[PDB]
């Protein structure tokens, strides 16, 4: 339940079983047990892989405690949803999403020479409608420059490429000046913070647009799934769902000795308890210990 | 919420807003005279200034007890609020039972009466399957895994295309 | 019996967290 690197990730989380294992470990430490030494080993690849597989154990049970704001009109449900995903990323050891995906860009193209190669390497992280708009600008300046546009910063091909990529990004709706002013910085705080307040209006626009796109896809998927399901007769629905339940339950009763399967069956028993305790008192809810 | 909060007996509500419960505070500089009045039973006390500041010393920290999860219950509530939208248009279906009598049987063409009885059987199919609300849970369990795999992103749980394109705008238009 | 707890009920159920933990426990020693 605790492996002494799991419990360091679970300190800053507010999830239920994570705080339960944290409280059990802290309670065992209060009865005179000793803190294990933190391993000063497992070099950068193993460290980043273990970070990836330790933050996911904070992320994914914390995703299931975030209610999707489906069918909710307005700004506040989508802002609540994106704020809860932000706080979940902060609890899991992520940075800001801007800083984290810019770190992904800097890690991917630490080795590139030409700008079409940074477009071939950050292909997976930018939208293809933006990648195509940058590729056509790159071919446009490549026709006139008669050289591969290198990733330099001061070459005339790069300057006349960036002066057009700023134009296409202004066309997309991304204010490139305020984003560059925030991520570059300024001296006087009363003129750096007046553009940080514009970067944060763009940033709030950006993450509510992304969370609303996720909510719209889940709405469309649930409506498509229901309207495929409402066309069946009831006996087909009952036998299909009973077969799916029985197969997924046999998959967990097949593998024994694993921790996930016995947690799966404990959770099935907990759903049966929830049904039983609602059955014994339906106008008050499930029986919570108080 | 935070560890130190700074509210209580200052710019507080002086009266209730609806007539379902009556509440008045006769606040002096030091303490307050509150009489809460709700129907049959009404209560009254003198709440200190050092009590409304001492109330947020411990936190309640409310949390939802769900059958499976809160995400699953949000998806199931959406499925239920869509099945209500389909039920509302199975609610405006015309009563075919007012045309079952034998004066409607023998006046009608045989194939049109067979089509009419098939339409009645079809409505019973649609109404029997739109009110199978014990299927919505296993329908919501089909939206959960793909969404929850999209939130196990290697970048961030909250990352999307707009923030990643804006960060590529910052990254590409900086000095390499 | 009934009336289980409060922290035992706040936990989301069919999240993975133990397939991720199983993949960590079968992967991180195998890559060390």
């Amino acid at each position: 339940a605790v492996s002494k690197k799991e419990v360091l990730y679970f300190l800053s989380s507010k999830d239920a079983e994570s705080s339960t294992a944290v409280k059990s470990y802290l309670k065992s430490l209060y009865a005179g047990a000793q803190v294990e030494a933190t391993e000063t080993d497992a070099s950068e690849l193993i460290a980043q892989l273990e970070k990836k597989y330790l933050s996911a154990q904070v992320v994914e049970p914390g995703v299931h405690n975030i209610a999707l704001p489906l069918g909710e009109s307005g700004s506040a449900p989508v802002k609540r949803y994106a704020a809860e995903l932000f706080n979940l990323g902060a609890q899991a050891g992520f940075e800001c999403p801007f800083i984290e995906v810019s770190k992904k860009f800097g890690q991917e193209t630490a080795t590139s020479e030409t700008v079409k190669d940074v477009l071939n390497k950050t292909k997976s992280y930018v939208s293809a409608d933006y990648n195509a708009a940058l590729n056509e600008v790159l071919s446009s300046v490549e026709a006139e420059i008669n050289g591969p546009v290198l990733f330099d910063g001061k070459t005339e091909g790069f300057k006349k490429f960036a002066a057009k990529a700023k134009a296409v990004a202004v066309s997309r709706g991304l204010p490139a000046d305020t984003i560059l002013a925030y991520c570059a910085g300024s001296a006087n705080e009363d003129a750096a913070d007046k553009v940080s307040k514009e970067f944060f209006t763009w940033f709030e626009s950006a993450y509510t647009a992304d969370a609303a796109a996720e909510v719209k896809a889940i709405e469309a998927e649930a409506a498509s799934i229901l309207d495929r399901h409402l066309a069946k007769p009831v006996a087909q629905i009952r036998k299909e769902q009973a077969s799916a339940y029985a197969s997924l339950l046999k998959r967990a009763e097949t593998a024994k000795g694993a921790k996930w399967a016995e947690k799966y069956l404990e959770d099935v028993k907990a759903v049966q308890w929830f049904d039983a305790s609602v059955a014994e008192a339906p106008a008050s809810g499930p029986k919570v210990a108080a | 919420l935070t560890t130190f909060t700074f509210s209580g007996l200052q710019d507080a509500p002086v009266a209730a807003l609806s007539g379902s419960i009556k509440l008045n505070v006769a606040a002096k500089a030091g303490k307050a005279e509150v009489t809460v009045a709700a129907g049959a039973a009404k209560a009254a006390t003198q709440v200190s200034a050092a009590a409304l500041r001492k109330l947020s010393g411990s936190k309640i920290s409310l949390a939802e007890v769900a059958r499976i999860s809160v995400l699953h219950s949000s998806i199931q509530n959406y499925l239920l609020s869509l099945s209500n939208e389909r039920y509302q248009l199975l609610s405006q279906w015309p009563d075919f039972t007012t045309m079952y009598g034998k004066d409607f049987y023998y006046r009608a063409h045989p194939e049109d009466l067979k089509k009419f009885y098939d339409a009645a059987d079809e409505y019973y199919k649609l109404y029997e399957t739109v009110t199978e609300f014990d299927s919505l849970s296993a329908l919501a369990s089909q939206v959960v895994p793909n969404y929850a795999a999209r939130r196990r992103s290697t970048v961030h749980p909250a990352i999307g295309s707009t923030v990643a394109d804006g960060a590529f705008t910052n990254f590409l238009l900086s000095k390499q | 019996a009934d009336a289980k707890a409060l922290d035992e009920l706040r936990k989301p159920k069919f999240s993975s967290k133990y397939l991720i933990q199983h993949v960590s426990q079968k992967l991180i020693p195998a890559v060390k």
């Binding site: 990836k52 996911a56 995906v101 997976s124 992280y125 930018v126 939208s127 796109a213 996720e214 719209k216 896809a217 889940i218 469309a220 998927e221 409506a223 498509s224 309207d227 495929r228 409402l230 066309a231 339940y245 997924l248 339950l249 998959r251 996930w260 799966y264 959770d267 099935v268 759903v271 | 059958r67 499976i68 939208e85 389909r86 248009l89 199975l90 649609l126 849970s137 296993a138 369990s141 089909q142 959960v144 895994p145 929850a148 795999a149 999209r150 939130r151 196990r152 992103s153 290697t154 970048v155 990352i159 999307g160 295309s161 990643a164 | 069919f14 993975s16 397939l19 991720i20 199983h22 993949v23």
Partner: peptide, 30 residues
């Protein structure tokens, strides 16, 4: 009510693939 447990990551950043509108409301009005 239970779902298949998956342990895999999303290495790309993609728009979330909105699904097409079904004709079930139009077919039930028909």
């Amino acid at each position: 009510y239970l779902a298949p447990l998956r342990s895999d990551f999303t290495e790309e950043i993609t728009a979330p693939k909105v699904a097409s509108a079904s004709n079930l409301v139009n077919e039930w009005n028909n």
